[PDB]
Amino acid sequence: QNPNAGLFKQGYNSYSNADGQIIKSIAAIRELHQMCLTSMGPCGRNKIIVNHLGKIIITNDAATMLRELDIVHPAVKVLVMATEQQKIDMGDGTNLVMILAGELLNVSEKLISMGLSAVEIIQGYNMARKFTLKELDEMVVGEITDKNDKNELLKMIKPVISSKKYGSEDILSELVSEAVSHVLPVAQQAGEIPYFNVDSIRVVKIMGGSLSNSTVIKGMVFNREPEGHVKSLSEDKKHKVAVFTCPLDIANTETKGTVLLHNAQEMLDFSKGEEKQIDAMMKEIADMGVECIVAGAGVGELALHYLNRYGILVLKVPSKFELRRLCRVCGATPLPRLGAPTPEELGLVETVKTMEIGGDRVTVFKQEQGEISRTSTIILRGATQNNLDDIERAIDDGVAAVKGLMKPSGGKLLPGAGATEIELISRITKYGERTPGLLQLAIKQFAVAFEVVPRTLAETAGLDVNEVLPNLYAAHNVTEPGAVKTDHLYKGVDIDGESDEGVKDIREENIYDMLATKKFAINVATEAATTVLSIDQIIMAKK
Amino acid sequence: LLNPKAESLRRDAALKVNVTSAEGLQSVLETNLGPKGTLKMLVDGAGNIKLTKDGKVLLTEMQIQSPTAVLIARAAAAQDEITGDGTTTVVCLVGELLRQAHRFIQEGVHPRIITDGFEIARKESMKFLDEFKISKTNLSNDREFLLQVARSSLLTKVDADLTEVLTPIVTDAVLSVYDAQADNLDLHMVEIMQMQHLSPKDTTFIKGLVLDHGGRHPDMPTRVKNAYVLILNVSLEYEKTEVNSGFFYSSADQRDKLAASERKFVDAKLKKIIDLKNEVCGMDPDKGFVIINQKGIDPMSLDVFAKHNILALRRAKRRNMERLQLVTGGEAQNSVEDLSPQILGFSGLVYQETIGEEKFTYVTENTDPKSCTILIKGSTHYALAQTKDAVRDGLRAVANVLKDKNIIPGAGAFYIALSRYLRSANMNKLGAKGKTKTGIEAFAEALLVIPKTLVKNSGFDPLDVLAMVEDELDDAQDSDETRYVGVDLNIGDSCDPTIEGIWDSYRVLRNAITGATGIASNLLLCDELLRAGR
Amino acid sequence: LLNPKAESLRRDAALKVNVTSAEGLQSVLETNLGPKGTLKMLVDGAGNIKLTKDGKVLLTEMQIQSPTAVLIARAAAAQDEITGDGTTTVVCLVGELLRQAHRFIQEGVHPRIITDGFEIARKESMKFLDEFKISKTNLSNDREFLLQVARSSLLTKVDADLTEVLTPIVTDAVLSVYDAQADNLDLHMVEIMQMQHLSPKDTTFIKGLVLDHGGRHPDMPTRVKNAYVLILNVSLEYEKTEVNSGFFYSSADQRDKLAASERKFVDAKLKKIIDLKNEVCGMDPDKGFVIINQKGIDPMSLDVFAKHNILALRRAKRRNMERLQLVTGGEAQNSVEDLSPQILGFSGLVYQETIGEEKFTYVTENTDPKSCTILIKGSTHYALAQTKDAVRDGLRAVANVLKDKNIIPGAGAFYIALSRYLRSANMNKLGAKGKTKTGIEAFAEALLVIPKTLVKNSGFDPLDVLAMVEDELDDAQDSDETRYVGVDLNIGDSCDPTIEGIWDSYRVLRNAITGATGIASNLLLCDELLRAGR
């Protein structure tokens, strides 16, 4: 009896700005905004998620969690798609993009209720974004020389491990930086040819031990068994490795070729035929100097018997992704046939041995000097499986941080730990009074939206908001008796954890944020909030 | 007067429902009009995020049971097949015209006179349409004026930050494909490529043609300047018998015997291709040699092409090969035995963009390419859909500028002047009819919805900006010269649409008045909603 | 944000409901407006039935919860106390002015500009009010023109059959009590009495005063011509001894002896009264002697006065006796001993209407009566109330014509012209504001409701009559002359209001335009409806 006005389409869902859906869309994001507020920072924690298949995934990274969560509202999917922009390109800063984009909608909610048009809200952020991009170039304090030294890598990697896993940042930094120096060649002042990739560092784990007992290998590490009576090869230089896609067995016909026995006469011929043919093919491989054979397919019973007499190490890698990284080290190439070890396609390994690390004997793959490897692997050890899986996800974020050292402003850095977001407030408000017109409302609120980063770090650390926050404003804003500002520009936001009064200087712990990561995160978070504010209506249909 | 399972609206109740249902769709596309409008997200059942302001794309992605929007959907389909743009504006004209006419329905005005007042005003609108239009010269030096027309189409469908990026791209895309003569233009000759990797702000224009599958070898040269392109139909890759078979050699002597059978056809063609590089471009610097090779490449020829630094290509699209014949000029060579240097074409700098997932090849910098490629970049999927909608709407908007020599200024200059003219035309002339002038005034009052809508989405008072334009038009009527006035959305005051550079196509606005007249009239002509057929 | 036992409407919904509630009262009073209107019947629930076309009389009987209509009823309170007629016209001007402004409120126009636009147009209407008015002479020979003025008031409240009967009655009632000079007129001197059991077409005018109690006796003369009126204040009923005593009688014959002793006190006064008749014109022909005698009469004096052919009356109202002193001129005589012939007055033919239930004595044909009586006779109850509402509105309508020397033509002559003047004047002046144009245009369109409402009740198309009048006014301006045009309700075309005889008082339309604008402006000023005090 009671009609409904405004919907002429169908019984599907129609979201219009008349009832304030733009506020409800932010409220739905606000529910997931506080989710990321419990993630970023050293006080954050991983979330336990059980898949529909009965699998438990535990990770601290929020961008990975978004892939494991079911998103209903399509307005959140825009932020999820914008979050992947930060994870795919720079690989770091996903927490800075999602939290800021959620706060840009919070400060815009006060402008919508005030009566300010959403078009002038977007126009204000577009003008404030160009004002921020010009300041980020002048806010650079130090610059990474790209020396690729182990001590120089500890400066960038330490804050990357920070706000993910706390207390292990001293041990994990030496493990990650050691593997980076192994995959990087010797060069300087050359940005033409890229070197470091994201697959150059493999992460393996084993139960037992601790993080202090972990080591770093210069090449791929295999946790499986040698599958033969030969445990390891010798120490001789430049061992030959052959990768075979064809399985190890008597040569057959590509079409069918199933062995059948009609009579006992064919039994002695086919049994001895497999013995003479395989031994003849394995002998030609051993005569060429190949002490290691990589079999991508299954291995027969008679094949393992002859490889033990010739002293050839058996290796089986069914995964094609591991074979690609194997070609980058020794130079071997998979051969479509069996018994033809062409020396041009063969690889060279300096040292390959089977050693016991973490309680179990594993056969690793590494080098010494020649045949420089572009791929390395870090062996992790620990007594806690939950924290062990979290380090695996934390190293992957550190691998992408090394990639940010390339030509697009890789050396420049900005002070982190809340020091950058607060300093942007005084610089943007300086341009607020400079730009006349209605843009002053959106420009001032754009700088206030940066207060969520220092407030979240102080709230999760147990510090009083009424105490640390007014000290943060007085740290970046001071009155100097002179024309040139001086003394401390290094005052950041401190997590404490033991005790302190006021704040601390960033120069003590050398916690810095890359310019390429921060400048790219602001543009993504601005365009993400621009899309949400530009949508005043959402049309959906039931599935 | 009914049968079981029947619903029928009679008297004026059906007119009240049709106008009320039209007011709903009006407000949907009202906030989507103009560069200051709103960008709405539409997802039906696919989880696919799409943001576009085009009026026709909205109706195609949404299922509407309302019968009033069905005819409006047919109106947006006719505007795209003729004008190609302005689908949102036509809907806003039909919606408000029904509201102004519905108020006169309660007054007792019969809808036939309402439709008769529209046809009389439409004929008078065509008279002002020829007087208000501005004839643009056919000269090709108008690119500067084309930049103003290009921005008018771009600013509507994007956030206005991408307009400055696509301004040189879209403008140079039309002039490059269109030779300067009477002739005509073909938009199909301009290719569109889509990539989800790089940001949308980094997009650039491709003067030549781009292809997908390139040859993969570590020694291939990155940049080759002034290279000759050769289409190759023969297979450079090892082949097998139609029935599954393989060649397995047990000795080095059997290796050369079995492998030679597969490479016999390869080496016969391969040795004759490298001889062409010895005769042509052997000594000569600043030249190059490129192979198309629609079919695959064996790993043996990859080392041969690396010794001579020959750019290798394999698995080429057949549709792109027909365009390579136009861009490069080289004829398709079915057999290398008949290959001649006259078949070889000419191309400029060819450099391959190296990305792990996909690789590109640029045939660009050609003497007579006679083709264009618009490369669309974006981070997300909806950013690619919005940009692709702006390019396809931008190319079709500029297409009507060169074909139709007449141009009209935008920013409400055509709508405010026509609404004021038709109101003062019937008062001075008095040649229409005594009773019909009521329905004619409804059409004149319905022409001001667009300038009031442009300022409504920007938050400005539509009554304030309307009085400022009328004060400028009265000053223009006092002077005997010709001065055009328009609404400035950024500042909020009036503006000269010729200086600001806001221009609208003549053909789009010519069919907008006639199109919105017949569609809105048929909705008022419906007395009863008939439910039958079941 | 609420209080217990309270209801409130926020945003603009509080104003939209107040306008919508005012539109409901408009549609009720839209049907009864004008001579082509309808006669409404209201039922209190106690058995009372009233048929009245007046606006205020209906509003007082009706109970309305809507607070907007309450102010409309309060707005009409000052209309009847000043104008006395046209309360329905004022309501139609308030309602339509809110409907025309309702369209502009939905567009986002602030109500202050709408309110100020009505006040500025109100001041400009008063300037055009003095230009459009026609100055009428003060001569008393205008009764012929007053006949057409009386028809304007009468034709509205009746079926037009009683207009020709009430035209000479109402017109002569005002002119008789009004001596010729500037001065003024007093409608209190006109008494309205009623009697049932007769047809309404028998209504006649009474120049004198009508008395309630008539003389009862078969020998009393019915028609007496040229009789002397005598006001007698003594009691002629049975009297008692001046001192306290009692009646002691053995037989019934002795009771009459004691009773006759007290009856001699009355007989002594009766002998002195009859001596006055024989003293002055006792036997003279064409002469008569009539006794008023406010107090009662005993049955013995009825036979004494009948033998002398004297008209005797008893039990007269105290208020009606004060009029007999002014009309006849006879002084009040308290004592019979002091009775003198100088107290006797003079009167013309006195004839008594003989009806079993009631008898009326006519004091008419007097030298200086200075009073009048309008006798409204009808069979039913609503026939007495309908005509009495028309006479009281008719006497007050003619009153404003003689008091105010200015007269205005009716039949929409002022409403159509002022709506045309304010339309063309606002464009030429442009002295208010650009945003005020919405308020001025809304007031101009709100003045056309009356000419459309009058013709709508007649059945003719209000659209066709509007076009014919505007075409005739435009042709009159081209001829350079003064021609007034009005709506003819009988034929359906236009008419000359000066020839047809439809005229409206200047004071009625002056307070109508000012009153309807001020009250409707206060309705738009309402932000919120607050409920408190419960």
Domain check: are C130 and C63 in the same one? yes
What is the number of other CB atoms lying within 10 angstroms of the CB of residue A93?
A: 29
- In terms of Cα–Cα distance, which of C215, C188, C240 is closest to C316? C215
What dihedral do alpha carbons B478, B482, B483, B484 form, nearest 10°? 120
Q: How far apart are CA A535 and CA A540, in angstroms?
A: 13
- Distances A402 to A205, A220, A329, A377, A406 between C-alpha atoms, Å: 22, 19, 20, 15, 8
| CATH number for the domain formed by residue range(s) A144-218+371-411 | 3.30.260.10
Domain check: are B529 and B465 in the same one? yes
**Identity of the residue in A8, A118, A337 whose CB atom sits nearest the CB atom of B64:** A8
- In terms of Cα–Cα distance, which of A378, A322, A350 is closest to A182? A378
Query: Looking at chain B from residue 379 to 438, which residues have their Cβ under 8 Å from any Cβ of chain C?
Result: 434-435, 438
Q: Tell whether domain A219-370 is in CATH 3.20.20.70.
A: no
- Which residue type occupies B203? T
CB B14 within 8 A of CB B105: no
CB A514 within 8 A of CB A156: yes
**DSSP string across B99-142:** HHHHHHHHHT--HHHHHHHHHHHHHHHHHHHHHH-EEPP--GGG
Summary count for chain C: helices (H), strands (E): 18, 18
CB C499 within 8 A of CB C473: no
Answer whether C493 touches B (CB < 8 Å): no
Nearest-CA residue of chain C relative to B430? C471
Domain check: are C349 and C475 in the same one? no
Q: How far apart are CA A100 and CA A79, in angstroms?
A: 11
**Identity of the residue in B103, B438, B467 whose CB atom sits nearest the CB atom of C434:** B467
Domain check: are B389 and B433 in the same one? no
Alpha helices in B280-378 (DSSP H): 299-307, 318-327
Going by beta carbons, is chain A in contact with chain C, meaning 3 or more pairs sit under 8 Å apart?
Answer: no
CB B505 within 8 A of CB B404: yes
Q: State both tokens at B256.
A: 């050369």
What dihedral do alpha carbons B383, B385, B390, B396 form, nearest 10°? 160
Q: Any idea which residue has 């006679």 for tokens?
A: B370
Q: How far apart are CA B177 and CA B188, in angstroms?
A: 10
CB B457 within 8 A of CB B34: yes
CB C514 within 8 A of CB C123: no
Q: How far apart are CA A20 and CA B380, in angstroms?
A: 27
Q: How far apart are CA A426 and CA A422, in angstroms?
A: 8
Q: Name the minimum distance, in Å, from the CA of A532 to any CA of chain B.
A: 9
- In terms of Cα–Cα distance, which of A362, A365, A363, A361 is closest to A350? A365
A143 SS3 class: strand
Cβ neighbors of A79 (< 8 A, separation 6 or more) are: A29, A98, A101, A102, A528, A532
Q: What is the CATH number of the domain that holds B37?
A: 1.10.560.10
Q: How far apart are CA B348 and CA B228, in angstroms?
A: 8
Nearest-CA residue of chain B relative to A79? B380
Q: State both tokens at C270.
A: 């009766």
Q: E strands along A325-369, which residues? A: 334-335, 347-349, 354-357, 360-364
Q: What sign results for the dihedral spanned by CA atoms B204, B208, B210, B215?
A: negative
Domain check: are C29 and C108 in the same one? yes
Which strands make up the sheet holding C311-312, listed edge to edge? C311-312, C288-291, C227-232, C332-333
Q: State both tokens at A193.
A: 């040819």
Backbone phi, psi, residue C108, to 5°: 100, 10
What A343-349 contacts at long range (C-beta under 8 Å, 24+ apart), as own/partner pairs, is: A343/A288, A346/A240, A346/A241, A346/A242, A346/A288, A346/A290, A347/A240, A347/A241, A347/A242, A347/A243, A347/A371, A348/A238, A348/A239, A348/A240, A348/A241, A349/A238, A349/A239, A349/A240, A349/A241, A349/A292
Determine the residue among B379, B384, B493 to mutate to test chain A binding: the one whose Cβ has the most chain A Cβ atoms within 10 Å: B379
Cited resolution, angstroms: 4.7
Q: How far apart are CA B421 and CA B482, in angstroms?
A: 15
CB A177 within 8 A of CB A352: no
- Distances B295 to B76, B234, B305, B307 between C-alpha atoms, Å: 44, 7, 16, 21
- In terms of Cα–Cα distance, which of B292, B297, B303, B299 is closest to B325? B292
Domain check: are C321 and C291 in the same one? yes
Q: How far apart are CA C430 and CA B55, in angstroms?
A: 40
A537:B28 CB<8 A? yes
Q: Any idea which residue has 């182990």 for tokens?
A: A150
Domain check: are B102 and B231 in the same one? no
Backbone phi, psi, residue B409, to 5°: -75, 145
Residues of the domain holding C381: 137-207+370-405
What percent of chain C is helix, strand and coil (3-state, nearest 5)?
A: 50, 10, 35
Q: How far apart are CA B373 and CA B323, in angstroms?
A: 11
B250:A6 CB<8 A? no
DSSP state of C406: E
- Distances C402 to A502, C133, C174, C179, C182 between C-alpha atoms, Å: 94, 15, 9, 12, 9
Domain check: are B194 and B143 in the same one? yes
CB B345 within 8 A of CB B222: no
Q: How far apart are CA C234 and CA C231, in angstroms?
A: 9
Q: Name the minimum distance, in Å, from the CA of B24 to any CA of chain A.
A: 6
- Distances C23 to C72, C102, C438, C447 between C-alpha atoms, Å: 12, 11, 20, 16
Breaks (C-N over 2.5 A) in chain C follow: none
B434: chain C residues, CB-CB within 8 Å: 467-468, 470-471
What is the number of other CB atoms lying within 10 angstroms of the CB of residue C258?
A: 15
Query: Looking at chain C from residue 105 to 144, which residues have their Cβ under 8 Å from any Cβ of chain B?
Result: 107-109
For chain C, give the number of residues: 534
Domain check: are C244 and C374 in the same one? no
**Identity of the residue in B108, B467, B468 whose CB atom sits nearest the CB atom of C462:** B108
**Identity of the residue in B438, B463, B470 whose CB atom sits nearest the CB atom of C438:** B463
Q: How far apart are CA B516 and CA B87, in angstroms?
A: 10
Nearest-CA residue of chain B relative to C467? B434
Q: How far apart are CA A76 and CA A71, in angstroms?
A: 7
Cβ neighbors of B68 (< 8 A, separation 6 or more) are: A8, B18, B21, B22, B25, B523
Q: Any idea which residue has 């497999």 for tokens?
A: A274
A132 SS3 class: helix
CA A158 to chain centre: 15
First vs last C-alpha separation in chain C: 18
- In terms of Cα–Cα distance, which of B55, B56, B49 is closest to B34? B55
CB crowding B324-333: b at 16 or more within 10 Å, else e: beebbbbeeb
Top CATH class of A1-143+412-543 equals mainly alpha
Q: How far apart are CA C461 and CA C488, in angstroms?
A: 12
- In terms of Cα–Cα distance, which of C238, C232, C234, C222 is closest to C311? C222
Query: Looking at chain C from residue 309 to 328, which residues have their Cβ under 8 Å from any Cβ of chain B?
Result: none
Q: State both tokens at C146.
A: 């007053």
The residues on B that touch A, with CB distances below 8 Å, are 21, 24-25, 28, 31, 36, 38-45, 47, 49, 51, 62-66, 68-69, 159, 161, 243-246, 248-250, 255, 379-382, 457-459
- In terms of Cα–Cα distance, which of B387, B448, B457, B495 is closest to B34? B457
Cα-only R_g, chain A: 30
- In terms of Cα–Cα distance, which of B131, B163, B195 is closest to B502? B163
- In terms of Cα–Cα distance, which of A164, A176, A133 is closest to A414? A133
Q: How far apart are CA A350 and CA A240, in angstroms?
A: 9
Domain check: are B464 and B419 in the same one? yes
Q: What sign results for the dihedral spanned by CA atoms C72, C75, C80, C85?
A: negative
Domain check: are C219 and C364 in the same one? yes
- Distances C401 to C134, C139, C148, C327 between C-alpha atoms, Å: 12, 12, 12, 26
CB A376 within 8 A of CB A184: no
Q: Name the minimum distance, in Å, from the CA of C524 to any CA of chain B.
A: 19
Burial of A516 (0-12, 13-18, 19+ CB in 10 A): buried
Nearest-CA residue of chain A relative to B64? A9
For chain A, give the number of residues: 543
Q: State both tokens at C144.
A: 């012929």
**DSSP string across C136-148:** ----GGGHHHHHH
Instruction: Please calculate the CA angle B132-B136-B139 and round it to the nearest 5 degrees.
Output: 175
CB A224 within 8 A of CB A376: no
CB C337 within 8 A of CB C356: no
Q: How far apart are CA A536 and CA B461, in angstroms?
A: 20
CB B397 within 8 A of CB B85: yes
Instruction: Please calculate the CA angle A230-A233-A237 and round it to the nearest 5 degrees.
Output: 170
What percent of chain A is helix, strand and coil (3-state, nearest 5)?
A: 45, 15, 40
Q: State both tokens at B365.
A: 């910098």
CB C56 within 8 A of CB C86: no
A78: chain B residues, CB-CB within 8 Å: 41, 49, 380, 382
- In terms of Cα–Cα distance, which of C375, C225, C373, C206 is closest to C311? C225
B24:A7 CB<8 A? yes
Interface B-C: count of C-beta contacts within 8 A: 31
B380:A74 CB<8 A? no
Q: What is the CATH number of the domain that holds B159?
A: 3.30.260.10
What is the number of other CB atoms lying within 10 angstroms of the CB of residue B155?
A: 20
Domain layout of chain A by residue ranges: 1-143+412-543, 144-218+371-411, 219-370
B65:A531 CB<8 A? no
User: For chain C, how many structural domains are there in total?
Assistant: 3
Provide the β-strand partners of residue B529: B9
H or E element in which residue B24 lies? helix B13-30
Q: Any idea which residue has 């304090």 for tokens?
A: A141
Q: State both tokens at C345.
A: 């007055």
Q: How far apart are CA C167 and CA C391, in angstroms?
A: 10
Instruction: Please calculate the CA angle B86-B87-B93 and round it to the nearest 5 degrees.
Output: 90
Burial of B83 (0-12, 13-18, 19+ CB in 10 A): buried
Domain check: are B83 and B94 in the same one? yes
Q: E strands along B110-230, which residues? A: 134-135, 190-195, 205-206, 210-211, 223-224, 227-230
B448: chain C residues, CB-CB within 8 Å: none
Q: How far apart are CA B176 and CA B171, in angstroms?
A: 9
